[PDB]
Amino acid sequence: TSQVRQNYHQDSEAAINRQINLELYASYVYLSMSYYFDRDDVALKNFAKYFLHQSHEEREHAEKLMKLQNQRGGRIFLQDIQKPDCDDWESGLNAMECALHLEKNVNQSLLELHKLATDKNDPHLCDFIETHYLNEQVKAIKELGDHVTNLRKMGAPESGLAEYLFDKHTLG
């Protein structure tokens, strides 16, 4: 090559393509979690609305990176989007616990990409990550920790009244 490409390393380009896939995959997990709470034998409508919004967010995270790639003169190479690992997610608390784990995993990936940009001396990539992904990631993780703590102290998942009230008063 592009007439526009400048100080953009191959390794950086490839790592962007992997991140794009990870984010797409995270969107998928969340999509799954959402319609799980919409089942008639589950029926926690605010849980459902919470993971649907999360699902849309993650999609937007990917499309931003797709945009960054073209901007720097790289080429987008897409891969399959894997099946979320679970079909059944058991309870409200369990689902929150799996989302916390998911987000911590996305942050390592992002911490690794940032260390690579640094090594390649790509200050434009470093700030992009720092500015649009890292602060969003710590605020996400703190929020899911808050949620898990509350559910747990209320007595979930053994208490059905506890997930019902949390759905109403916190997620509502």
Q: Is 87 in the site for Ca ion (CB under 5 A)?
A: no
CA–CA gap between residue 14 and residue 160 (Å, rounded) = 46
Answer yes or no: is 137 a known binding residue: yes
Q: How far is the CB of 37 from a copy of itself (least distance, A)?
A: 10
Q: Determine, following the binding rule CB under 5 A, whether residue 147 of this chain makes contact with Fe ion.
A: no
Q: Does 122 bind Fe ion (CB under 5 A)?
A: no
CB of 46 closer than 8 Å to CB of 40: no
Measured CA distances, 150 to 29, 48, 95 (Å)? 23, 18, 14
Q: Please identify which residue in 53, 73, 90, 119 interacts with a copy of itself, judged by CB under 8 A.
A: 73
Q: Is 96 in the site for a copy of itself (CB under 8 A)?
A: no
3-state DSSP assignment of residue 29: helix
Binding partner at 135 among Ca ion, a copy of itself, Fe ion, none, C-beta below 5 to 8 Å by kind? a copy of itself
**Which residues neighbour 164 within 8 Å (Cβ) at sequence distance 6 or greater?**
44
Q: Which of residues 15-54 bind a copy of itself (CB under 8 A)?
A: 28, 31-32, 35, 38-43, 45
54-83 residues near Ca ion, rule: CB under 5 A: 80
How far apart are alpha carbons 53 and 37 in whole angstroms? 13
